[PDB]
Amino acid sequence: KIGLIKVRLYRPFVSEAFFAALPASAKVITVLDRTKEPGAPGDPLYLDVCSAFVERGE
Amino acid sequence: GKKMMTTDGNTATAHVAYAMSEVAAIYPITPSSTMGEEADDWAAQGRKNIFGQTLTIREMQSEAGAAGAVHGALAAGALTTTFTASQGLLLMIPNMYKISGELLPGVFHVTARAIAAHALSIFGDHQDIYAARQTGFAMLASSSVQEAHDMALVAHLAAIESNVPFMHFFDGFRTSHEIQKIEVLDYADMASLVNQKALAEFRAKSMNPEHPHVRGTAQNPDIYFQGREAANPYYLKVPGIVAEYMQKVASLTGRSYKLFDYVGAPDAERVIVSMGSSCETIEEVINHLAAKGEKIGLIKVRLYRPFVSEAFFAALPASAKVITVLDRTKEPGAPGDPLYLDVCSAFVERGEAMPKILAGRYGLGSKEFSPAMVKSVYDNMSGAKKNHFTVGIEDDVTGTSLPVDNAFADTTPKGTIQCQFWGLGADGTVGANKQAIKIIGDNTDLFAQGYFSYDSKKSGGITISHLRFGEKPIQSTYLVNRADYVACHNPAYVGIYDILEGIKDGGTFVLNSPWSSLEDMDKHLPSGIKRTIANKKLKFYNIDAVKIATDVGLGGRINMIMQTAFFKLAGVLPFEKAVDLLKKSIHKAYGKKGEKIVKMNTDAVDQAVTSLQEFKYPDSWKDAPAETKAEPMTNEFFKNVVKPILTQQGDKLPVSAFEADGRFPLGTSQFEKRGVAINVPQWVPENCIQCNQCAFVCPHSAILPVLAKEEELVGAPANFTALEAKGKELKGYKFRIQINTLDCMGCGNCADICPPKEKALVMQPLDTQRDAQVPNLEYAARIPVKSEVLPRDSLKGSQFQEPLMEFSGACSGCGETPYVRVITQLFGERMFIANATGCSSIWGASAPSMPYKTNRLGQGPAWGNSLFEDAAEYGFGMNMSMFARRTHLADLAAKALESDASGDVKEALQGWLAGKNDPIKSKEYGDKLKKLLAGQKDGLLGQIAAMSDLYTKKSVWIFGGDGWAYDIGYGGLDHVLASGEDVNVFVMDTEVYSNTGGQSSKATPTGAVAKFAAAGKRTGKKDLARMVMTYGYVYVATVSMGYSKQQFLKVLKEAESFPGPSLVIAYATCINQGLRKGMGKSQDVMNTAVKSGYWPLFRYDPRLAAQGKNPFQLDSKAPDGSVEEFLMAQNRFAVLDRSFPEDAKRLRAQVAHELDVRFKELEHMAATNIFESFAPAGGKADGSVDFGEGAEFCTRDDTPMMARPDSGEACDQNRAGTSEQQGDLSKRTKK
Amino acid sequence: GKKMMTTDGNTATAHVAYAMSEVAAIYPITPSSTMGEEADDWAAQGRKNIFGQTLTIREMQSEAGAAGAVHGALAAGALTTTFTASQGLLLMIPNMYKISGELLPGVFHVTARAIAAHALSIFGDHQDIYAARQTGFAMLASSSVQEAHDMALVAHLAAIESNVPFMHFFDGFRTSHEIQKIEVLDYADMASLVNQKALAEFRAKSMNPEHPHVRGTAQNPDIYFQGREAANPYY
Amino acid sequence: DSKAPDGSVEEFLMAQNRFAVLDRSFPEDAKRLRAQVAHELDVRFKELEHMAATNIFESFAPAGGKADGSVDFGEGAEFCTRDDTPMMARPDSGEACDQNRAGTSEQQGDLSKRTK
Amino acid sequence: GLLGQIAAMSDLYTKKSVWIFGGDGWAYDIGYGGLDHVLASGEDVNVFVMDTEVYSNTGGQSSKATPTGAVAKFAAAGKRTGKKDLARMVMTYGYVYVATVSMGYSKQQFLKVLKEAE
């Protein structure tokens, strides 16, 4: 039971569209970033995805 | 040891940067310029860093240049720093990846400033620093002046020990320009904290042929990723190092810091996370609200990068139920701004309690962030909890803003005295206020804060000072809105601004005006003020500063008088104490013209203290009759947008008031009519010879030549004196020189230039001219401009054309504006203007004043400012669009000729086609086309009809200063001119970076004194003109209006008509140059600049060569020997002669020698028998061919860099020798 | 109609960028150089865009110059594009804030390449495109050669209608140089998707002395914030 | 350091594909462009001979000087040397000065004499 | 003491020679503004430009050093603008040493140039 969410439109980042592609059964999600921002608490995509979940508040 | 000091954020940081650095690569950009200039002064003064050496400072050609030099210095083992911001920081980003990537201990001190998007802004916000967050630089923010000092130190110490470069930043202006009494450490103290082991390691690993290594290799997929991650250990240790140094510094200063610091209730339920100066204001509010039981708190972020969650949570109260993250930026389309994103990620990884997190945006471009706004943020967390909100604006378009209740109580510490001062530019108010802060700070235990708001107007501008004094630390990082003391130093303001807004009941109001009697006061003082004074029971004081000043002999200068008023009425200090301190300071300074000037001055203080009595006002003032509203006609736009902005009410303008793309309409300056000139010219008809030279020379278009027919003067005012028009072409016309007294700036160039020995123009006091000339100007403006009576490009005729750039915010007598104004009179209706940032973009388009305007047909200069570094390329793109779009049009016209279009249409189409690039013919047939195709909406003809704005040949112009042309934009300018396309570049050479504060540029001459050339520039002026003439196909010319208006007009015509690139360099006088007799002598100075041989005039025209003639033409004569007087008449040269006579004498001698040689070289060129051919085109033809097609050997390598879709064919790779060697070998191998 | 062809990401995108643009300001940088060279060769050969005109392409002195030219061309009403990557994209950042800030339908096609830090690399990753994420450009990612063509088209069409500049990007080499048998659309088909009214309005609001306006003003604290938020509706 | 064009330019050009390919693809444009190149270098060499024959030398100034000390360009100026803008504001700015809104020194002096 | 500090700085004893290496693309185009500024500074640095008359590494694209009529990318029908005269532009300063070399013509003049320039 595995899946993948492909990001087409990175900016603007639409949380609504992101969740419309997220399976309700997803227990663990790994956000892959193809970059490195030294000292950042996380890379760009990961941070965007994290914000989506915090704002959903569920 | 420690030391008390009242200074601003810039100086507090520079103090540290200088001590800790050996090298500094610099470039000017507001508001960081002060730091670099300080460093230069100190180095020149003999100041030593922690190594006992003077700092090695150099000014580059741009921030990209500075960054590259900084990288080189660090790579070569020298501790290096730089100061920058906004656009400048952006240019450094590429090198920042390299500096961090190579683990160099560099430190960048940045005054966080907004980035230019819909518009440019020199003010503060975090848009710039956030743009560099992924570069690998550690980022440490300071939230106050004191912190700027402490964090600057921690940054340097940490960079050295960690090997990770630091970006120490503080809010532009709000912190960089705010003055506070703080404590700074001795350089010896800083030196003792340096990790000697690390410093030695730094030296040892640096570049050196004695023990070389290679850096900056190119790597493949096999190892790049591993190499990128090898620095991980260094970043993991930086936070602990930063924490370590905060502690070490603390043990010396007593001021402790943590990566994240918490303030507020230990059991707060609502918490704000913020960065920068906002934290000070937020803490102030917390102190106030918490004392009332509010469970609130604040987390101040010090170390933004690396972002350490553990340190964040260590500062986070477990009781917090709601947390709002404030970001001082805007990242369009992002799900959230930077800080908010980082915080969200902290809670997600924590994987435990999830309080509600809200995101808020604030302070863009130094937008106020006041207590009332902080209150809104905290109230939002207990109420509606709106997310992704904005505060400080009214967003009536998308509804993202938080309502702000400005009735919020004052939150300053108890006992704090707040003052506001309304001054006029150059009246010494700001200086007096600074002196006051120094004085009070140096003689009391009071904390002192000062902040100044200036004007976009360069001359006769408004300045408002905000000072605070108190027994407790001042954290009020916002303007004073409830003052105990308010002073208006310019009576004119009483009738235009809301001077008493927010003044506390019982507060004191001091006004400078000659309205001593009650009757006069009631006559000039508006009812609204009466309310206020009556209702709030204000201690109203009126002092005729001008009178006292004149009496004591200070020539009307009011500074010392208003200063005394402050010390006596502000209530910050006791009478006797304040007085002697003030007198002592007077004896301190001055002391130049002996006690003669001291006496203041002392007398002024004495005479001020006595004349400073309360104004006995009646109680009837409480109900002064509500004044009417005598308002003239105006647009919307002026009424609804610019008027409010000009009246300091822009902040109340909602988002719906502006264009999404930032555009503004032309001509808004037409209604400003400031009337700030002290003296204006008076026309004397009898002496006038009707030459129009006065109008031609005006820096503000304040002179309107009038040529009317007898009929047009029927309803003309009685004093609308007119003369019979001179000239055979102007028989029955009536001529008049109408002075626009309200737009005049009082520079005096016109009167100085008026030809007749018995001046036809004489300077007189504004008040003696306005009553009569205001109505006259209004009547003149309604008279049709006779543009079709004399040649447009003739001296006299040009002034009978509509000027399309008027009443700008340039200084009085500015040497740039006369040139541009006349250019619009020749090509204005069809020109595009790509303007480089600088004075010309500042007086040219500082919202809401737009000096450029349209003519009577609605046509006008299409003006645009992209960036400072790209003006040429920007104009080039405009040229490309026109080429593409007009080529499209031509293609459609060609198609139309091969259709059943009417004969008339075909005739016009053929006419346009043949003269498409001729301004006269293209317009002739284009206008016929507009009428013939009117209403056509279908087919081919329809498309053509819709392209009418492309019919007449346009004129693409690139405007820029010498800083742009000779330095930062040179590479781009050089490329655009070398392109051979039809663009016109006009360089206003002020021989210094004027707008930014007079920094040296490569256009600065030998011996001239300027910033970064404070001992007189030691390299000669770059010869941009001769460098461009080497191309042979570029039209190049130099002009100087004061020498010859004819040559200038001739140059414009020739340059613009040249079917190729044209470069025109103009000598622009400027206040920075220090003209000893006034800017009103600009034309004379321009005249001498040429006669002295200092500024030779010439033209290089490629089409002459095409006809066997010499393209180079000399327009001026050999040096007349007056250079010495020319130079000494300008302070930029004279000041050097007063401080360093020997070097100065020698440097002026060098300039005289340089110009003697150069003129001979020019003559040399003038007598050349070598003419370089010239041809616009001739060839092309459809088709392309690859440089490798049919090559005998491989023409591309085996690298992924040369790989292309069509590559891969076998070829001889030159590993078997030459064709002949291979042939000879084949022969030798026999078989 | 549709047309089959075996080509790489660069060509698949250039195929579209050429049809949808009138002007292009270029500078060479691996691995995006191919797109610019193709555009120039096609223009020299006489290939027509959706407007039946040959592309007006010029090589600048740097990507900073290219971005400046692109900004000028867009400001003056011409559909404009450019191709870049890594170090090049970094130099365009300042102008990118201007292009988005002025709501211009510019379109950047970038072959995502690593930024030079501890070392230089011409190979693919998102270090460069992430560096320009705050510039206000919309960002559309294509994950295959076929997608490069489709997303390139969407980017152009969407930029024209939205007035928000687009950055269409795909992995340097892994996609830019990978060859695949894909399907492309005829230029006529792309033209049929263009919002003519949006295009006409773009021309109408552009710089022109016949109906001028001022752009790139300097603003004080009183109105800057409001001006920066005025574009929300477009985004 | 070299001599006048020996006439071998033609290639010299045709021995390199970057020039030869044009000759094979666009013969007419090519021969005209090669002739243009030959003309360009002819003129440039003459200009270099021109430089070699001049007697107008620029007195070379090594360096040095420095002069321990510096001064601000505005020190002692008769009129304001800085504007009322936030861009030119500096720690030591703020003193009163003649902002050029009353005319030239002489014009002001004359007015004074006329007003008394 | 002082002797200890001096001893630790031995890698600074002999005069070093600072060189800037670059191709024509760098010197005539993108890096021109910086080169111009550095030369105008009057400091002791040596710039050596290897002019291949095209951006070689990237695939033979035209630069301002490319001559009239040369075919290169972005010059598909032969460059229609002449070669930029970088040498004469810099010579306008008067205080910058400028020289052109071509090994195949004279190794002797080349060596003389290096010695004189350095």
Ligand SMILES: CC(=O)c1sc(CCOP(=O)(O)OP(=O)(O)O)c(C)[n+]1Cc1cnc(C)nc1N
């Ligand atoms: C407002 C803005 O940010 C200006 S005004 C301009 C002064 C230009 O002088 P020039 O001689 O070209 O023109 P002048 O003022 O007529 O003398 C500078 C240095 N800048 C600061 C600056 C620095 N570096 C960069 C990349 N961008 C900007 N905008």
Ligand SMILES: CC(=O)c1sc(CCOP(=O)(O)OP(=O)(O)O)c(C)[n+]1Cc1cnc(C)nc1N
């Ligand atoms: C490897 C890298 O990214 C190369 S190699 C170099 C070719 C230089 O030509 P030049 O004539 O100066 O030298 P030559 O190769 O000897 O001919 C370019 C254009 N760049 C791409 C490029 C473009 N633009 C920017 C800002 N940075 C880089 N790195």
Ligand code: SF4
């Ligand atoms: S005094 Fe100056 S601003 Fe006034 S009309 Fe004369 S030239 Fe113009």
Ligand code: SF4
């Ligand atoms: S400069 Fe003097 S003489 Fe000439 S038109 Fe003006 S007022 Fe008359």
Ligand code: SF4
């Ligand atoms: S160029 Fe000089 S005189 Fe003109 S506006 Fe700028 S600072 Fe003032």
Ligand SMILES: [Ca+2]
């Ligand atoms: Ca021209």
Ligand SMILES: [Mg+2]
């Ligand atoms: Mg200047």
Ligand SMILES: [Mg+2]
């Ligand atoms: Mg090369």
